[PDB]
RNA sequence: GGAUCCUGAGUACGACGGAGCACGUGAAAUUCCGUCGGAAUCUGGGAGGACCAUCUCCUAAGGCUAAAUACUCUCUAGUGA
RNA sequence: AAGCAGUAAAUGUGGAGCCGUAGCGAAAGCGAGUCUGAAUAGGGCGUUUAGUAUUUGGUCGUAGACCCGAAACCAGGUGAU
RNA sequence: UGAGGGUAGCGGAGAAAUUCCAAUCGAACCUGGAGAUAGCUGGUUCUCUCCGAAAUAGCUUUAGGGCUAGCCUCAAGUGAU
RNA sequence: UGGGAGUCAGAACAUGGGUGAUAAGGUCCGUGUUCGAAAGGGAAACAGCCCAGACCACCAGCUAAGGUCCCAAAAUAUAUG
RNA sequence: UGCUGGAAGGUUAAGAGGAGUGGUUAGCUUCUGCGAAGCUACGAAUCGAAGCCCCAGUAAACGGCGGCCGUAUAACGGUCC
RNA sequence: GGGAUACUACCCUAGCUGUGUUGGCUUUCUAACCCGCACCACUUAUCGUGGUGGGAGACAGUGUCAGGCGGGCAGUUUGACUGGGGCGGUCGCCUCCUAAAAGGUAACGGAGGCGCUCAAAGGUUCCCUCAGAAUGGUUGGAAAUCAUUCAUAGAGUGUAAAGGCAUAAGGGAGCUUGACUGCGAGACCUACAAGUCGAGCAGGGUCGAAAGACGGACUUAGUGAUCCGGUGGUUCCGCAUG
């Protein structure tokens, strides 16, 4: 309150709405694989276990910033489209699930 | 002098304002401008 | 008090500020202002906009040279050496 | 106890990456046969909170 | 098996107007109120927050119910940076 | 965290849950890109590590909230010695 | 003029006058809400150091109130800006 | 950059202007300065004028504004009128 | 104006007449209406109490009991209202 | 001619009878229901009770719903500025002067405009170029119209004043429709809200042979958030899925 000049808050219109079902994932980037080995097959409750995730959100999503250094298959609900890209650069796939 | 609010050819809803009046300008005009389905200047006419 | 009665002339205008912004020598932007007037007191020369109001830009960066225009007015000449 | 918020302003504004607000703009939602063509695209924007009002209102929102 | 039978009537439900239910006779779909009306009885019905299809859950209108909680006029004993 | 062993303690136990580690966009969605969309352009937002838990101090906020102090309003009662 | 009775506060009474209804009334007194409210006055408890203002915009059912700007202070940063 | 504030009644002089009556120790703006928030000396006393800022001592000295016959420190100084 | 009264010329609730009907969909045709007899529910031709106009009356009702040229209905003739 | 008799909604001009059965209106009954309605008595309680007869009577009243009145009642409001309140006034925008040669700035301080208008006064090519003055003459109230020569844009320009203007931004001829979509670094303003000018970029067209040049009028004013409501389209969502 200002002494009645206006508040910003109606000098200023409500917009918007929420998808109320707002859908993303437990995400996870791409260098963390590192830790890992080569060939072997990665799965999300090995990663719940491994603490790369603490939990699923909605399922599991990927993004591709990091790199690699590991061959190797996974079992994922969703990839980007450099995601699966560079899984199968070096080699090894994604079982999406 | 009065407003204007005109519907395009096709282009479907409510965008284009001029001023005219129904003295000078007594009857429905029309004439050429571009919209935007089009890219083009196409001719628009007053309803 | 008493009777004091009807009472009318104290309009006036919300002021606008006007004139220049920037000056001789003095380095610019590409929408940079260079001056706000009404008419033509001074002309737009090299690599300058003149907006509705006669407001003028410099088309450009650079820098400035105000200077005579006629042999009675006055413009501006941006030159953007570097 | 918990504080709460604005949930008018709730209704109103963004959160940015940093810590910033990200507001509608208004002289909206109505008549622009009165207005022009660059105000009617440079209104279709939005822009942010000046840490004027952001001091005004900090404590307003701990919840975004 | 259920083929046949009993399955909670002025009830359900509706109109009116009032509250409540976070939420405005309301969406109030849910639940009560008072005035008018006013149902099926499975082979049927109820819901699924505008709302219905399909889908699903249940099968109303009959009753009883410890435990996990609440406060201290109490009493006892004790404690008090 | 609740909760539990414990003892009006600690400690231990206790992972439901909370924050962060990717952002963009009302949204659908996409992602170091995103939005707008015509490109990335274009610019906004980005983008390009370090934060987390407890505590101290300051400040704010809801509770009378630095202190005293009205005229008055309402509810229920007393009174015609 | 007495002794006994009857009238109650949004009310009573009233040869009317805001006049009376327990030394007081333009609607009494007791309690309670209630630490009612108070942009209003007053008040606000030991020391030393260092810095150190303002009384101006501007919008206000606003003018002796407020809000930001302005001008202070403190520590993070920058670096001749 | 961010944390914490108070200030919104200002006053007088010079100065500029308006207004008023080339009124007002007026009234409104402005440019300076002082007080407010700043003691000390000078103007007899004399918030705003002149000189001028105190860290604490000290029976030391130099000067400023102003002053130099007595109260009261300093020239009855010179020389001129 | 208020009060009463009235032709009531007509205009006027809660009242009736009924031609026809969501979101989703069992219904007449597998590009398609009898709205019938279907969940969160519905239409006009018309009239329609109190009244609303219209007209009377209405001054020990309220009200006015006026005004101009010549004139401090304080005279008069022109006088208006 | 005044509508208008094929069928004819139905028909005043109707007639007549009540029919699945019922109430149209008014009556008669009366139980209903009532009766501060009189006699009998429990109850010497005549209250109440219940007979009695009489009344009225399906009426109102009563419950809901409805709508007209309603200081009878109750709660609120009843702007500010102001050389005290005060009546008067004024309260939102634009031009100038005060304003002090950057800008900026007061006064119940001085003067003036505004709550629009131009489809041509706009856009774009190609022409024109002053009123006015005298000069002077059918006109003539000198002057109109016309004509000679100078006139500073004194012309004039849609809208007050200002600057500005013959690049004409003034005036005409023709063309037309940029009074275009989606953007823009950037800069001004300012406390905030806001507000203001843009290179240019795609794009694409008008006119023009083009060159290119047009994102509304020479500038400035033309009412004002937001919520709400409405309307249409709709990368959206929209509930177990649809």
Known sequence: FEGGQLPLFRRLPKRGFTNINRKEYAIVNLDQLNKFEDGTEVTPA?????????????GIKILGNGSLDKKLTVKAHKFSASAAEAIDAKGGAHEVI | RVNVTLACTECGDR???????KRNNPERIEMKKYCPR?????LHRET | KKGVSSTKNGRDSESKRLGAKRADGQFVTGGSILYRQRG??????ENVGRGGDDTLFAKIDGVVKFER????????SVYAVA | PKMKTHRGAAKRVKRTAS???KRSRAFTSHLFANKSTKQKRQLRKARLVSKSDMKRVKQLLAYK
């Open chain 1, 46 to 58: 090995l990663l719940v276990e491994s603490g790369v995730v603490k939990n699923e959100k909605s």
């Open chain 2, 15 to 21: 965008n284009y304002i001029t001023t005219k009046n």
């Open chain 2, 38 to 42: 089009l890219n083009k200047y196409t």
């Open chain 3, 40 to 45: 033509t007191k001074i002309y737009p020369g």
């Open chain 3, 69 to 76: 225009k006629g042999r009675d007015k006055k413009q501006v």
């Open chain 4, 19 to 21: 810590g910033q607000l």
